[PDB]
Design a protein around this ligand. Structure first.
Ligand SMILES: O=P(O)(O)OCCNS(=O)(=O)c1ccc(OC(F)(F)F)cc1
Ligand SMILES: O=P(O)(O)OCCNS(=O)(=O)c1ccc(OC(F)(F)F)cc1
Ligand SMILES: C=C(/N=C/c1c(COP(=O)(O)O)cnc(C)c1O)C(=O)O
Ligand SMILES: C=C(/N=C/c1c(COP(=O)(O)O)cnc(C)c1O)C(=O)O
Ligand SMILES: [Cl-]
Ligand SMILES: [Cl-]
Ligand SMILES: [Cl-]
Ligand SMILES: [Cl-]
Ligand SMILES: [Cl-]
Ligand SMILES: [Cl-]
Ligand SMILES: [Cl-]
Ligand SMILES: [Cl-]
Ligand SMILES: [Cl-]
Ligand SMILES: [Cl-]
Ligand SMILES: [Cl-]
Ligand SMILES: [Cl-]
Ligand SMILES: [Cl-]
Ligand SMILES: [Cl-]
Ligand SMILES: [Cl-]
Ligand SMILES: [Cl-]
Ligand SMILES: [Cs+]
Ligand SMILES: [Cs+]
Ligand SMILES: [Cs+]
Ligand SMILES: [Cs+]
Ligand SMILES: [Cs+]
Lengths: 394, 266, 394, 266
């Protein structure tokens, strides 16, 4: 049995081989106990503030919303140590691994930001860490491979399947299923089997909590909507969580549309796939008619995953959150716009969320709205990718 | 499920265990696959464990991953596996047939509909690798409604609650996990005598050991320990891989290995 | 005449062609007036907090000082938007250019961090910006070239001379001498003619001010010493300034030793050069016996400059600050050590300061000391350089 | 400094201005340089402005930067420039000789020692490009002690305080800056008549216009405006650059250009 509900409505669960159930129950118990331990919370807070640099800025864009009644703020997770929001929950999971007595870490990564975060946290806290990365993503996110290597982590390129995030995830779990007495699997997003979706949300909720406190201080009211890109769902649930009971606040999740939904080359199973069971959870999947898990596609490695965390499927199902998609080309234009008009170089992942907020502004420019975009990371890892595209155009 | 009971009641009257091979269906092609399976049975397989090609076999190491990929290259789909299964049953009326499934293929077009189709083609049991006992309810219920034995894993880290649920919910045979990890002949299997005894105490279905069985010594060991038999999937698929261009010598090398394995169980 | 003293003892002054004196006096007057304008200070504070992310963390390293009586804190300027301390004073100088009514920006850059900072600030505040970079540094710091380009700035590679920082500086000033009615020259370090050394120090002093406030809160006492790398001198004077009247606090500046002082291939004129007049100031210079300005050398582009700001020459002369050097190899070992044992990838510039604090610890490990290292920037721009070295060794 | 006064008092008695060429000393080699300078004087130079190769000529555009680099390639050092200067003075006893210096070369071995050496070799004035009037004290004092005219720049953005300091402190000639920017024949020069009048009002030294003078029309313009003359450094060095392999045609092309320039001043 479990201490906490493993499902969000129909979505979620623990679909792993029986061998891994003691590992999941152990982690769940460690989490529940740690959330009650003021000494674990103080240590977590200490790392977040003094090591990662929280709280992050909330930046008001004045140039990009000119001539419109949109006020746009960016939650600056790009300024966090490591360059993205991934760092937040990795500090918490590293403390949990140590609370359990574990000594090794396994992790999967696509945009390499979660791998970088797992490697830096393991180096700080004295854990031996190994990261699985898809050989395609080794290439398109290569600044992060050597960052990982520099920090004492072992990086394992994954040539299976699409050689992207989902293939890394499969090797990660295969490995954990034969390492778990000593290693903790530091899953990088709010997906996978229970308790990961719950843990990852609680270890990222400071995104939404700070945003709430900061907008009230600056604007005296809640935002009309908060907007985040949705890979597995960690930064968006971290932004959403503290607003879920504020029913006036729209929660907008942005899936990668890739080359266009109609092409089939996208990463939007929440709206364009079908519920399936894979990676330990019941959740929307991109899949063939006869149940084979399909390959996803995004220009952004960090969104190039063919499922989504179960809490997002549930928030969608009851109407509490709305999900949309943004294509590669839209995400590229949003990247350029932020660089040239706000002097922030955003991750191509976050650029999807920016691109949707700009669409909300442009489509209805006399509508009064206060929007927050979760700027989930910086785009240094993307500049070569973006270079090669812009040069092939002009 | 009544084929397993009939088997074990005759295996024991002959003072031997069961040797159950595993292969992927359609590896390396539909029609060579069938002659692999006919050759396993004629060489002395007591029952079969049969995998349906899946896009993400997360309990399987590279040997069986490659089996899966070979079947995909052959264009082998689940619907073609079920026509294969019907031909195997129509050739082999008493041989118990178990499937190794992943949850998504069972859930894809309806859990009940999946088990309805298993019954239609003559499957005797279904093991769903990524479904623990905690999530097993709809799988075990649909299996029982269509007379399919739901196979449960007894792991080496089994506590007592697990033993008693597996014992009560399972039919056909209880799966004795050799070790942690994924399938592979590379990693050989802790002694499992104690779990075997507890399972018998609680009227579990009879126990077969799997994960890592690669040599005749391993097989006799498990029946020596009071288990009912052993399963070997890889070291069997590697014989298949070894002879992709050598179909004739593939089957002879298989036949040799199998009651080499079966004899160890007598 | 001037409103403020242009010299620090014998060092400093305004050694520019007569044509540029009205530009310097204008900037000085604008600065003096802005420092009295609570509305300019509020706007500056707004950008620093909400846009750049100040205050930065003060991180205590626990692993690297183990087995010693040294407590080492790192002032995390690497977490500032842009990736280094350069961003602080560029926001102030951008506000000054706008206060003056200017509309274009000129800047020079070596490690490309100042160019990146000038480009992002110009994009945010609506200024047209052009940056001069040495063609050698284009190469060894290439992640920053396209960052600059992405943000709407014009980047001009400098093949003259050593094709490094000092050559960029010469083109910058040549250009300003014929653009100054419309462009403001945004000099990137605490050097050059008055008023730049003073302005750059006051626009970076929040480094030392925050460090003082943070160490008192965490340790209840001032540090025994603060340690910073010294290119032109901006991050070190920003760290030092608020401690100058705390005479118990040691102020340690670290020049690049390059391949070894005895090789002549270094960037340490403060200790190993001779006073000269160049780049508009009287300051220690590396130069030939007959007065030609010599070429400097550092593994770190950001320290590869053959002079130093005049306030550092003065603090040295009266004994208030001490200056030392750290070689390429020492700086490389400090880079590796921070990556593997604290999970921070530091700029090769800052690694020089880290390397000296580690020497202070290692040489006298039973000495009780509280040290702060100015972590002037992150090392993402350096990972390729460092890769190619470590691979040529092992 | 008394050579400049003698000159201007005879230029004016002949109703003309002065044409003062600039070259870098030792560009493109010591001994070709001397024959350039002898050729400038025989072609009609009234005085000379002579640059000493410096590692960072920040008031100079690419033409003269390249002049500097050519002299460095020739191995030309300051000490060799001063031996050149002595030979030029010993050949040309009445031609005023001014140096264009950068501050570091003057300060390197002592400000007073630099001006002592200028006097020893017969230099008449020194202009230090990166020293404004605000930092000029030790330079102007050492110059006056060794009978060297300190040359001050009157810029086009000159306010009144500047005019009156330049007027009082300067000797020899006042330098009339044509424009902002760095040296170059590329950028041609705002009319400067007004500054000329104020300078005369305050007993300034006589005024020569420089920075951008490239054509005979430009030269007659400046003397037309009541100035005393014009300086052309580039468009002269480019003739030098043009004919690196053509030393003979270098000098003829120079001679042609110069009293082409000088005549425009009559
Ligand atoms: O000989 P090997 O190493 O290839 O191992 C035998 C594997 N063949 S199988 O169908 O029994 C088999 C049995 C259980 C599996 O997963 C689970 F344990 F999680 F349920 C997967 C495959
Ligand atoms: O013909 P050009 O364009 O080459 O201009 C003439 C330049 N030759 S020079 O020695 O008089 C000369 C004069 C003044 C200079 O700098 C200063 F104005 F800042 F003082 C530099 C060179
Ligand atoms: C998959 C990865 N990146 C995820 C990511 C994402 C998508 O992951 P989540 O949906 O879990 O936030 C969004 N933004 C940034 C900057 C990201 O790096 C990874 O680093 O492995
Ligand atoms: C010269 C540059 N870099 C300077 C630098 C320095 C040296 O500059 P200052 O001495 O002015 O701080 C130190 N640390 C970092 C991260 C730096 O980028 C430049 O970006 O142009
Ligand atoms: Cl519960
Ligand atoms: Cl349910
Ligand atoms: Cl809590
Ligand atoms: Cl294990
Ligand atoms: Cl609250
Ligand atoms: Cl690039
Ligand atoms: Cl048989
Ligand atoms: Cl039973
Ligand atoms: Cl003063
Ligand atoms: Cl003085
Ligand atoms: Cl102030
Ligand atoms: Cl101008
Ligand atoms: Cl205070
Ligand atoms: Cl690399
Ligand atoms: Cl003559
Ligand atoms: Cl006079
Ligand atoms: Cs902060
Ligand atoms: Cs607006
Ligand atoms: Cs996705
Ligand atoms: Cs210590
Ligand atoms: Cs330096």
């Amino acid at each position: 049995t479990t201490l906490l509900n493993p499902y969000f409505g129909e979505f979620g669960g623990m679909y792993v081989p029986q061998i891994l159930m003691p590992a999941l129950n152990q982690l769940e118990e460690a989490f529940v106990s740690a959330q009650k331990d003021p000494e674990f919370q103080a240590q977590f807070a200490d790392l977040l503030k003094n090591y990662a640099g929280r709280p992050t800025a909330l930046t008001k864009c004045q140039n990009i919303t000119a001539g419109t009644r949109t006020t746009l703020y960016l939650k600056r997770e790009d300024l966090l140590h490591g360059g993205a929001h991934k760092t937040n929950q990795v500090l918490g999971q590293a403390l949990l691994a140590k609370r359990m007595g574990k000594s090794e870490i396994i992790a999967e990564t696509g945009a390499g930001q979660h791998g970088v975060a797992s490697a830096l946290a393991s180096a700080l806290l004295g854990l031996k860490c190994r990261i699985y990365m898809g050989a395609k993503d080794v290439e398109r996110q290569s600044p992060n491979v050597f960052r990982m290597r520099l920090m004492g982590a072992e990086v394992i390129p994954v040539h299976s399947g699409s050689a992207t995030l989902t293939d890394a995830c499969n090797e990660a779990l295969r490995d954990w299923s034969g390492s778990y007495e000593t290693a903790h699997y530091m899953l990088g997003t709010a997906a996978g089997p229970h308790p990961y979706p719950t843990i990852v949300r609680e270890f990222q909720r400071m995104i939404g909590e700070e945003t709430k406190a900061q907008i009230l201080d600056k604007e005296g009211r809640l935002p009309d909507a908060v907007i985040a890109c949705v890979g597995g769902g960690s930064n968006a649930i971290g932004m959403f969580a503290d607003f879920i009971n504020d029913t006036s606040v729209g929660l907008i999740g942005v899936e990668p549309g890739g080359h266009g939904i109609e092409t089939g080359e996208h990463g939007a199973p929440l709206k364009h796939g079908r519920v399936g069971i894979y990676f330990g959870m019941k959740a929307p999947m991109m899949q063939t008619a006869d149940g084979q898990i399909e390959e996803s596609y995004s220009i952004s490695a960090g969104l190039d995953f063919p499922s989504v965390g179960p809490q997002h499927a549930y928030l969608n199902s009851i109407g509490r959150a709305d999900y949309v998609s943004i294509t590669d080309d839209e995400a590229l234009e949003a990247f350029k716009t932020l660089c040239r008009h706000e002097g922030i170089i955003p991750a191509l992942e976050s650029s999807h969320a920016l691109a949707h907020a700009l669409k909300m502004m442009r489509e209805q420019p006399e509508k009064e709205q206060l929007l927050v975009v979760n700027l989930s990371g910086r785009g240094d890892k993307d500049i070569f990718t973006v270079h090669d595209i812009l040069k092939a155009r002009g | 499920m009544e084929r397993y009971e009939n088997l074990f009641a005759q295996l024991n009257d002959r003072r031997e265990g069961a040797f159950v091979p595993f292969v992927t269906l359609g590896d390396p092609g539909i029609e060579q696959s069938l002659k692999i399976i006919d050759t396993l049975i004629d060489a002395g397989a007591d029952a079969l464990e049969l995998g349906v090609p899946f896009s993400d076999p997360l309990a399987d190491g590279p040997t069986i991953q490659n089996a899966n990929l070979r079947a995909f290259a052959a264009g082998v789909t689940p619907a073609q596996c079920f026509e294969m299964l019907a031909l195997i049953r129509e050739k082999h009326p008493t041989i118990p047939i178990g499937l190794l499934m992943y949850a998504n293929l069972v859930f894809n077009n309806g859990i009940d509909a999946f088990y309805a189709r298993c019954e239609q083609v003559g499957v005797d049991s279904v093991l769903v690798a990524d479904v623990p006992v905690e999530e097993s309810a709809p799988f075990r219920q649909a299996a029982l409604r269509h007379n399919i034995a739901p196979i449960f894993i007894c792991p080496p880290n089994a506590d007592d609650d697990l033993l008693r649920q597996v014992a009560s919910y399972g039919r056909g045979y209880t799966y004795l996990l050799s070790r942690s990890g994924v399938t592979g002949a590379e990693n050989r299997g802790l002694p499992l005598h104690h779990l075997i005894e507890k399972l018998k105490e609680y009227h579990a279905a009879p126990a077969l050991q799997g994960f890592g069985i690669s040599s005749p010594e391993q097989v006799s060991a498990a029946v020596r320990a009071g288990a009912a038999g052993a399963i070997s999937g890889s070291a069997i698929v590697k014989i298949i891989e070894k002879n992709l261009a050598s179909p004739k010598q593939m089957l002879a090398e298989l036949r040799s290995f199998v009651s080499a394995m079966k004899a160890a169980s007598r």
